[PDB]
């Protein structure tokens, strides 16, 4: 009686054949860096404060894997500055002479190549969360504007 | 060994040349006002209680800027009440003849046009928490439903 | 002098014609059950300790209504166990054969169908609080993993 | 042998360039005001009793500063009453025509603008405590309901 | 001089149109009961000794109401044993088959229905005190574990 | 008989095969460190005073394990000081050359990798408490600003 | 006539399987050591005046346990000072190179590891009281500040 | 054998570099002023009986310090009556227009600002005691109600 | 010089519109009944030796009121024995099946209801005293254990 | 005529089977 059409429901995910599976809330997440003053980034090589984002690994099997690492893939600003991530803002008028950096567990910038992985982290039965930090890196005289970027990650067990 | 692609992360931020930087928790926050009885908003001009939301400014350098004002931009319900915010929840199920206001620290409702700033608030060399209040406003008889709203805010430095 | 686009702010809420209105801290909330040892949840029908949450009502004019009742609604775990919440979390790394159970103030499991309301609670002309408990119910052998559940509630007067 | 994921912890603090550091307990605190009768708050200008609360300053240095003053940045209930906070608990249930006044050590209310500092208090080497009080102030005929207000403070060291 | 953001102060209170107001130290209190022997509570229907806690009433006016009473609400341990508090502690390491009973000044357990008020008490102009007791009641074989109950009370003035 | 939708409730827990279960109030807690002085933290390697927190373990069973230890996982400042956390706040406004660090009951800094556990504590057959002290560590010249750090702990029974 | 919601009443306690039960006045307590002088706590190994307190045990039976002892657990100062409880007040304004230490009835410091227990005391069929002293121990040149300490104790029978 | 969790114990105190140490029984002492009739306080300038409390100092040496004075800091009830302490009771049911006054050996009141000091007493090697008196000083017509006043104190040596 | 933070003090009292003021030693006193033998209280109705305390009234004005009386409010053990206070020492190790009784001046036990006042006593101008007796009262067979109770009292002036 | 309240009285004691 009065059965009407609904809509469309989509699904996403991957059937990984690995020790640990990435959390559904960590596969696709956003990191709200906030706002940065150009005064803190005016000098070449200047670095802003960092915010922390975590990656959650579920159903870890310590029987086959003990150490885990993560490598980040993105678009570098330049060959010389390969650890800094360029800005992929959709609209025009974005920030100039700035980028974003993903730090390591030991407070080191991660190379965006795919062959350099994060610091080895011990895995735990069940849920194992590993932390990361995201910060702004100024390659020169900063300029006000939007600043958004994207990066994928690949986990090695 | 068993290297597997995971997902992706989207960094969102803004670079400004002002003297303060809005907090990461303040650039996008979801104030929740709970439920409001129709008895409170039955008549025109009746205002519900207020729920406080505050915008935090970080790394404020007072040597270049003394005070800071915040203005709000949004869609008013009608020209009769240019100080409220129209509901933008969905096509159906929204409440009728109701709205939400944004109150400055002085106690006067702000103007949702993006040009009328708030009262000047002095700053200090550090974290600055500018307080605000959100209350429901009735433009007539309030019918039951949902109530969601979105408003942009701009910060001036004088 | 200079001005900058600060950001965006969202507001959420509901307008109701009932006698009471649910508090902003009670419309949406999260509780921490805490870790539970698998030894405690060994056989079917096992029960763990119960944490406490509550729902806050306001402006409860006893003239309009004197009693309040609550009916919950979530995802059951089995056809037989209609009163046990299923664990609605990420696909991998979730505890199995166990669910969350909601206890009314009379110490009884609340049906999740959405039509069986809780025991009637008398109201007063002012702020009110209705207590509830969350415990764990195991339908077999409990397994290690996380346990997150979401359940809506509906108040009757 | 067995290793189990426990949970997470967050540490919150502030590094400051002042003479005294605010105590951890006084940085975030919940003053309790119990209940107030409408007969006590019946007509405009009424005032309930005052509930005591103090802010503790740790690791003070007499050489760099000798006096301490504070100023509260809250939200005024009305444009005519700038020294009274506005209740903010939920969109429905709060009390009307009632706010809270914060009295300094001289028994005078402090305006909620963040610039009018309270009376100066001489400091001591080491731990120091600055006393205050909080009371209910009625702007008209009080109405039963909840009453929760928030206010941040800025401390100067002349 | 130098100024810094100290912190935030929250106030919690409630204005009510009642004959009496409840004390700030009595609206939210913690009662320590201490350890109790599983040997003493092993039998079904056992009873431990009681711990005394009291609720303070302020600004009582005998003209408005001459008597007062208190009713309690909380989660009952069982359907049969409806006058015993349940356990509101964490989900692990909590003593089962035991609960807490509220004893009125008449030495009787109070039903947790919320509409069953305790015995009437004569009021006087000024501060009043209403005494109560808390003790452990066993529904079977008591087991080792923690015990942290919780309840919410409604005061009736008539 | 009006029936109205109220809202939603979420639960969080982790059923584990462990000797002891972590307390509900300990799986996710906050530690307020108050404030600290730049003049105090000016020198490199200077340590401020330490505030105390603790992890509570419930439902311990000595039969399966008698000793418990935890290890804290976080983001170090750099390779020079691997035992000091790095602040995680908004992109602007945080302090520089200052980090939170954790000390066990032996008064030693804990390495932040999740592989080096704290000193093993003997457990009882009930509630147990593992204490820790969070303190500020300066890697150089301190700078005023906020400091919000995060860490995750992993319990091991052996 | 008029009904008004007053507030909440919390409870605390434990049910333990032991000969004795710790008194409610001793499950948690605050004891004041008073102020002390740096001139007194000048050199290493100094000692302040010892304040007294006690732990009360109720409902004791001697046919299931004859002797009792306690063990204290807290945070030590250094590796070379395993019986000096540290100071836990805040991130500023606390004394340095001085720590509270606990002495049993014999007059010997109790190790803060939680494993070593106090001197055995005989039990009586009734309320028992075990005395203790608290004092300041200087690990070096003491400095002005506050002194707040916490210690968790366990009872062996 | 059958080890069980006992509880927790808190130690509170201070370390100072002065020539005297305040006794633990006087650091946080409580004084009962009894009761007083409204008839005895009917006009400005009234007084009540003065009960005596002592602040005990031990480990004093005359080589370093010779004089000792105590300065009381509290919330003055009025600007004109700056030597009178207000009432930090609950928000309702407290007395009005009635304050507390702190005396000295000489018999005159002490200003509550804290800059001014009491009469200097010559110290002697060992244990010392400084007496004081507390009474009710009316600022006007008296009204019934409780009165709980908290005041800090500093000690000077010269 | 060398000013140090001595500490803090509290003052508790109450201003009442009554013909008499109660002395501090009466408003807060601790009376001790001492150890008793079970054989003395073997049967129901047997009582221990009675100790004597007293309450002191100050500034009693005969013109305002001439007769004084006292009513005690507490927790009765049973609905059959309503004149005996229950024990509130703790939740364990408290003497069972026994309570305390508060006999008036003439020698009769006073009901624990708040409206049952003592025998009228003529008041003398100045300072007066009212003597009361505290004793034990055991139903059934008394058992070893601590016996601590408490009760509030009201005074009526005619 | 005028009914006010005083303070409170705390009784301390023990029971022994000796």
Short mmCIF file of C-alpha atoms in Angstrom, two decimals, chain C residues 60-140:
data_model
loop_
_atom_site.label_atom_id
_atom_site.label_comp_id
_atom_site.label_asym_id
_atom_site.label_seq_id
_atom_site.Cartn_x
_atom_site.Cartn_y
_atom_site.Cartn_z
CA UNK C 60 7.90 19.17 31.85
CA UNK C 61 4.57 20.82 32.61
CA UNK C 62 2.64 18.16 34.53
CA UNK C 63 -0.59 19.75 33.30
CA UNK C 64 0.14 18.58 29.74
CA UNK C 65 1.51 15.17 30.77
CA UNK C 66 2.41 13.48 34.05
CA UNK C 67 4.15 10.29 32.87
CA UNK C 68 7.06 9.74 30.49
CA UNK C 69 8.01 6.52 28.68
CA UNK C 70 10.93 5.73 26.36
CA UNK C 71 11.19 3.13 23.58
CA UNK C 72 14.56 2.35 22.03
CA UNK C 73 15.33 1.27 18.47
CA UNK C 74 18.52 -0.27 17.09
CA UNK C 75 19.73 -3.35 15.24
CA UNK C 76 19.10 -6.67 16.95
CA UNK C 77 21.75 -9.38 16.88
CA UNK C 78 19.51 -12.45 16.55
CA UNK C 79 15.87 -13.31 15.93
CA UNK C 80 15.64 -14.90 19.37
CA UNK C 81 17.51 -12.06 21.09
CA UNK C 82 15.31 -9.14 20.07
CA UNK C 83 16.50 -7.15 23.11
CA UNK C 84 20.25 -7.14 22.33
CA UNK C 85 21.87 -4.42 20.23
CA UNK C 86 24.16 -5.60 17.46
CA UNK C 87 27.66 -4.12 17.25
CA UNK C 88 27.51 -1.45 14.54
CA UNK C 89 31.14 -0.57 13.85
CA UNK C 90 33.74 -1.12 11.14
CA UNK C 91 33.53 -4.42 9.28
CA UNK C 92 36.82 -5.88 10.50
CA UNK C 93 38.08 -6.12 14.06
CA UNK C 94 34.77 -6.19 15.95
CA UNK C 95 33.79 -8.41 18.86
CA UNK C 96 31.52 -11.28 17.84
CA UNK C 97 28.71 -13.25 19.49
CA UNK C 98 28.12 -10.41 21.99
CA UNK C 99 25.95 -7.30 22.00
CA UNK C 100 24.83 -4.37 24.09
CA UNK C 101 21.68 -4.55 26.21
CA UNK C 102 19.71 -1.60 27.58
CA UNK C 103 18.30 -1.79 31.11
CA UNK C 104 15.29 0.28 32.16
CA UNK C 105 15.06 1.75 35.67
CA UNK C 106 13.05 -1.34 36.71
CA UNK C 107 16.02 -3.56 35.87
CA UNK C 108 14.55 -5.13 32.73
CA UNK C 109 15.85 -5.48 29.19
CA UNK C 110 14.20 -3.01 26.83
CA UNK C 111 12.75 -4.33 23.59
CA UNK C 112 14.35 -2.87 20.47
CA UNK C 113 11.25 -3.14 18.26
CA UNK C 114 10.41 0.50 19.00
CA UNK C 115 6.87 -0.14 20.28
CA UNK C 116 7.61 -1.52 23.77
CA UNK C 117 8.21 1.55 25.92
CA UNK C 118 10.00 1.67 29.26
CA UNK C 119 8.31 1.85 32.65
CA UNK C 120 6.39 5.08 33.20
CA UNK C 121 8.32 7.77 35.09
CA UNK C 122 6.45 10.51 36.93
CA UNK C 123 7.41 14.07 36.00
CA UNK C 124 7.57 17.40 37.82
CA UNK C 125 7.24 20.99 36.66
CA UNK C 126 10.92 21.43 35.89
CA UNK C 127 14.07 19.60 34.88
CA UNK C 128 13.75 15.81 34.86
CA UNK C 129 16.11 12.86 34.54
CA UNK C 130 15.27 9.29 33.50
CA UNK C 131 18.02 6.73 34.24
CA UNK C 132 19.09 3.81 32.06
CA UNK C 133 21.90 1.27 32.05
CA UNK C 134 24.02 -0.35 29.34
CA UNK C 135 25.44 -3.85 29.82
CA UNK C 136 26.86 -6.65 27.68
CA UNK C 137 24.94 -9.79 26.72
CA UNK C 138 26.85 -12.69 25.17
CA UNK C 139 25.01 -15.13 22.90
CA UNK C 140 27.87 -17.63 22.96
#
